[PDB]
Ligand binder design. Structure first.
Ligand SMILES: Cc1ncc(C[n+]2csc(CCOP(=O)(O)OP(=O)(O)O)c2C)c(N)n1
Ligand SMILES: Cc1ncc(C[n+]2csc(CCOP(=O)(O)OP(=O)(O)O)c2C)c(N)n1
Ligand SMILES: Cc1ncc(C[n+]2csc(CCOP(=O)(O)OP(=O)(O)O)c2C)c(N)n1
Ligand SMILES: [Mg+2]
Ligand SMILES: [Mg+2]
Ligand SMILES: [Mg+2]
Lengths: 541, 540, 537
């Protein structure tokens, strides 16, 4: 006989799952025993939060779900943040959690909890299997749900006794969630005329635009047009070095960017793969003096300040390259040419440098200058994520990963561990702050164990700056943002990672190159100069 | 100056809502006051249940959401079944419910209840607005959610104080929910080859295949091919009288039909707009010796016994007429020609009738007396098995079933709505003795609207579907017998005309007079239910 | 061999469930087959809604859960309103519903639904059992949850295959949910002192005061004191004809009653079994600085205008009799005596159509204290709540927690089952009557000794006269006519009509003498209903 836990592993190996991020427990150790002989490799993590973070990173970089595996109760509830972040940022994840047996469901036993009810608000798919026979079906649809447009987390609760119960059904095959056609040809033609008749057409790329397939088709469009482009944070990597002329910056949390002015002067905006989570439409479209065209894999959500005049629902890559044929050779007006060149001048101006503290822009330029396009960069949340988002340039798809949907602390380091597994042989850079670093720093042990070729930069200010300089704006006074010091170099070494410090701005470029040449995980303490951070919230008008 | 309630009506005005089925209350009477001055016509209903039944009928027939409007607490909770039936059967509805004010939400006060949490398991979209400014956005997205593929119910809870609070925001224009392209051209080409290589290809049409646009593209294809089609109860209407040769019956609750045998012998099945709610794949694909091709607006759910080898997701109409081009002139094998002819004989044979009137002679009498411009609505029960498998409907959405939830009572409210969507047409409703009373209150609404309805009550004195299934499993019924209600008296309490068929010889006359009768009519039909156990027989 | 469904009936037998109001279906017919050979009697209903109303009535009248039994999907969802009403009005109910099998949970198949999630907002207990062995435990606790203080509805979803799966576990024996002690004796003494110092103390009885055990202890206290009392609608029946001197009306939906004044002039209010669902505290404790003492079986919920200075949590009957010993023989202030007498005087001051008061006085004069009277919701429920006096516990049942339409007639069928040999009177309006009128067939089937009065006005007056107050215009309240006599006779019940005010008393007496169900059409005069919401305070 073969039990339900066997049939979980079989399902996972039908999906081609190469790794599983887990922490074992009594209610789930059946599956961990099955994995001992066969199936995906098991990355033992040091907190379930980071196992979900790693699963989301796999989703972001491959487009197929990453997999975490945890036990009942506390193990399951430690996924909560990990899966909201996945779901909100379009990262496919399949979370597998144990549960008490079916007879103990309604009982007060150790670690009993309504797993499925908890994860309903934070997943595309939350379910508990109550028959071992249905495990193959539940998991296949969970994977398909996580991969289907508007990607996200699929949670499946597995009772201890169903995992141990015998079953004779086979695992379901690899059944790929399929792709769509392009938007209707009449709609694509309608959007084309609008763009041609426009005086300042602008492209707004969003979180779904930055997939390899979408980026290839978008670059194809930009090669054939004069079309200006602005990016949401997670759209990074769409334009290339070749097409950098089309790039007018990343529109962010405050409407104070050259990209925001460009969106205002537009009379026609083609949003591609645009999710409002990254940029509230009330920020850039308040007056409603623009035709919006919504190109996306799923219809739009209507805001007061987001009323698509047209929607091109279908495969972004298919619709855009159908639209490229219709827009090929479109040139811009001379008054648009003047406007765009002037904005590039402002864009290059803010990307210039200004104590033994290293200013954030010196970090960005030094690091960009030291890594090729074949290095993935992950980034935590904080003021450092504002600086990176608006000034660090990534020219190949999905080489600069941000948490801009839920903005959760700690993602950087686990994402980097996952990034190195997805992309072996490649260095990976992870950027965090002093506060968020401790949200996930436990996985430095997992990094050292995998010898992850990681270089983590901890920007040290001593405070939770993003929340602070916002508090200063609203109240003239921070509150609850200060914390004591931890020696980042000594911290790295307790884990057997290499720890370095940048005690001068003169010292930054040398420390980076030694760390990049260093084999195995490395953590660099960067005392950072946050004098200018309040300016990130300043207003243009 | 404008309050939140005004901005609800303005939103309804923007979606082109013609009617709103409502029952007022303290917490929602702001909106009922705004409807008094302008906006959709308000059909006062006699139970919130039937307002949601009608809302779903509007969605079934127009493809745009029907709207019900109810108050807090009891008004809201009486929508529950109406919204699960709408969601499970792809009927767009937007249910609007009042709630206690924001300051009273966490308090134990009259009619307080977590509206949004209650409807989460039973809707596409369950939300409570907590700012009057957000009303136009919440309702637009609720409407777009109901009409997004896999259509269903969108519930919006409306706190009293929000409806009364002022606001200056404008209503949001009609932002139509958009349609997809055809499935990728390489996938359509791949499906076409499989069908040409297939010894016996069969189409399985489902609940999404019976839309006007889908049906138009399906008929075009069948005009250009020799393709056999089997339908799920709610796929009714897809095949016209011209293409009736292609039709091999409706596959149902039991695997005992010629259409089931045809699905078995197929080596390639192209499912169009197929939702398994109507027919478990365990029931017709148990051996898994078929190429399944899933054509639909949304990807499939994987069963053990449903693993499509190809999926063509996209606008069904676009994908089908793309595929019609590739398959034009496809011919059957001569061994397929023989097989299908033999099955049509088995199909014609079962569709043959023997003081009670047999279910078949009802169907033949009724079909013979109503044109294709007459909508027919059916309740759930043994009558719904007879109607689903033996009443033929040849124009899209002229035979409405509850085959997703199998909810009792739907028939009569569905007819009241159907007559409002299609004025100047007769509407026939079919129910049994038990299900009629679930919804019989709305006969007052029908008389009020003078709905041109002709409601047939298949009278047996029991809940036969539950019984003959109980007899199959346990050799004994339990809790299926109930006392008799004079259907003719019942109709006349409400001011409707009541007729009874005392003899089979009297059926055709009684039908014709009822159809010529202006205003609602209820017909008591004493039926012969000796043969109903045979609907569940194992014949294969 | 024993299956899970057998073990569902065995559990019910252990709870002493006499009747089960149900509608069978494919997913639950296992239990309907088990119920065919033994155990609880099955009342076939004509809508699950009503099955839940009848179950709630059994809970209201016995204090032990009533039981309804339905199938998956539509059968389950037709309980929603029934169970939130029960839960809001403290009526113990155990709802049992079929569900698709455990392998088809996550499948898009007929009548599949998240039963447990749906009923979480509406019950004190919503669960699906996924192991037949766990059936006796899940039910026992469900029954105990429904009977537990702050009683309400417990929902149990039963997968079809679990019902069919073998099991050898036994059922669990009647597990009586237990009783509490009286509140701490220090707290009772503390409250007692506050009352003796008070110049005008007032009791506010609520929905948990009207249980038999509470009422007996309350009457004992009132016999030994000069305490004035005011009731919530569902507190009806607390005060006997002997102690009517203590009763100062039922505080209602508007703050315009003599009872609302005594509440204002009170310097101390001892609330007993008080649930704010019946009367929002902002209506009476709004303006003043009266000491609130919360006596109840569960702690209070803090309102801005309800901040008790003391709480006596525990068995209400034990607490009030302990407090009766501390307050025996306490007599009123002369300033309180004058006040009370004046407001008894304000109290007793209260066309072919019949005026609502004439109905109330005719009916009250015709029926004993051994006649249950149920009432629907509508303007008639205002007239009955304020002016129909009920002198024995739980003989006047109102839906004053959810205010759901249709409860009256099903409540009466259930009431006749729990109290056989007694006539039952049910009162409804033209609108609410059609919400539940189907069950007239069930009534005829059981020959329930019911007399149903339809106050026939032509509209939904409560909303109408409230709409008039707020907007000066009704909207959506008017509906066509139904012949209530012809309707009754469709079902084989007798139908009667009062064509004259002079004909009312005769037809009631003929209806009361008539055996089996009766529906009386009453054309009612609703001119004065606007005044129910008038200011007089
Ligand atoms: C899990 C989580 N906790 C808290 C926050 C709120 N938050 C956002 S940025 C921030 C400050 C982070 O400080 P640090 O990581 O040191 O970066 P800095 O802003 O100092 O550069 C906080 C507390 C969040 N978004 N997610
Ligand atoms: C709301 C609801 N309640 C109960 C059921 C279960 N059920 C399915 S068929 C049926 C019998 C219907 O009786 P009737 O309308 O007289 O039809 P018949 O089977 O006698 O033709 C019942 C109770 C259901 N499907 N929906
Ligand atoms: C199930 C339900 N539906 C609607 C309401 C709102 N409501 C409360 S009273 C009422 C009027 C009922 O009219 P009727 O029953 O005829 O009594 P009347 O006020 O006319 O005496 C309405 C619509 C409710 N509380 N519960
Ligand atoms: Mg910091
Ligand atoms: Mg019947
Ligand atoms: Mg009325």
């Amino acid at each position: 006989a073969k039990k339900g836990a066997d049939l979980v592993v079989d399902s996972l190996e039908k999906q081609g799952v190469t790794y599983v991020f887990g922490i074992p427990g009594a209610k789930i150790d059946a599956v961990f025993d099955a994995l001992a002989d066969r199936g995906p490799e098991l990355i033992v993590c040091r907190h379930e939060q980071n196992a979900a973070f790693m699963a989301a990173a796999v989703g972001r970089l491959t487009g197929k779900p990453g997999v975490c595996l945890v036990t009942s109760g506390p193990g399951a509830s430690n996924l909560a943040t990990g899966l909201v972040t996945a779901t909100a940022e379009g990262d496919p994840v399949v979370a597998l959690a144990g549960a008490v047996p079916r007879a103990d469901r309604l009982k007060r036993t150790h670690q009993s909890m309504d797993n499925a009810a908890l994860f309903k608000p934070v997943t595309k798919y939350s379910a508990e299997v109550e028959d071992p026979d249905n495990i193959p079906e539940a998991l296949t649809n969970a994977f398909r749900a996580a991969t289907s447009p508007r990607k996200g987390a699929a949670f499946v609760s597995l009772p201890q006794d169903v995992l141990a119960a015998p079953t004779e059904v086979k695992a379901i095959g690899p059944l790929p969630a399929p792709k769509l056609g392009a938007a209707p040809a009449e709609a694509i033609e309608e959007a084309a005329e609008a763009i041609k008749k426009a005086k300042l057409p602008v492209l707004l790329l969003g979180m779904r635009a930055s997939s390899p397939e979408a980026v290839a088709a978008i670059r194809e469009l930009l090669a054939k047009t004069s079309l200006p482009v602005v990016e949401t944070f997670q759209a990074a990597g769409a334009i290339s070095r070749e097409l950098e002329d089309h790039f007018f910056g990343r529109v962010g949390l405050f409407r104070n960017q050259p990209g925001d002015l460009l969106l205002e002067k537009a009379d026609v905006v083609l949003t591609i793969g645009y999710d409002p989570v990254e940029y509230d439409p009330k920020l850039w479209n308040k007056d409603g003096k623009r035709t919006i065209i919504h190109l996306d894999e799923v219809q739009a959500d209507i805001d007061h300040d987001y009323q698509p005049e047209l929607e091109l629902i279908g495969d972004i890559a298919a619709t855009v390259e159908a639209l490229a044929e219709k827009l090929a050779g479109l040139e811009l007006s001379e008054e648009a040419a003047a406007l765009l060149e002037e904005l590039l001048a402002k864009l290059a101006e803010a990307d210039e440098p200004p104590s033994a503290l290293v200013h954030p822009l010196q970090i960005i330029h030094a690091l960009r200058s030291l890594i090729d396009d074949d290095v993935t960069v992950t980034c935590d949340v904080g003021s450092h994520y504002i600086w990176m988002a608006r000034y660090f340039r990534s020219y190949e798809p999905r080489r600069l990963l941000f948490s801009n949907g839920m903005q959760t602390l700690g993602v950087a380091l686990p994402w980097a561990i996952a990034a190195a597994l997805v992309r072996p042989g490649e260095k990976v850079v992870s950027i965090s702050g002093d506060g968020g670093f401790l949200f996930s720093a436990m996985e430095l042990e997992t990094a050292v164990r995998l010898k992850s070729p990681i270089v983590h930069l901890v920007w040290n200010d001593g405070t939770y700056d993003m929340v602070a300089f916002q508090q200063e704006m609203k109240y003239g006074r921070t509150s609850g943002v200060e914390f004591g010091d931890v020696d980042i170099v000594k911290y790295a070494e307790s884990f057997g990672a290499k720890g370095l410090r940048v005690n001068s701005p003169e010292e930054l470029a040398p420390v980076l190159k030694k760390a990049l040449e260093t084999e195995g995980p490395v953590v660099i303490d960067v005392p950072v100069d946050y004098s200018d951070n309040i300016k990130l919230g300043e207003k243009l008008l």
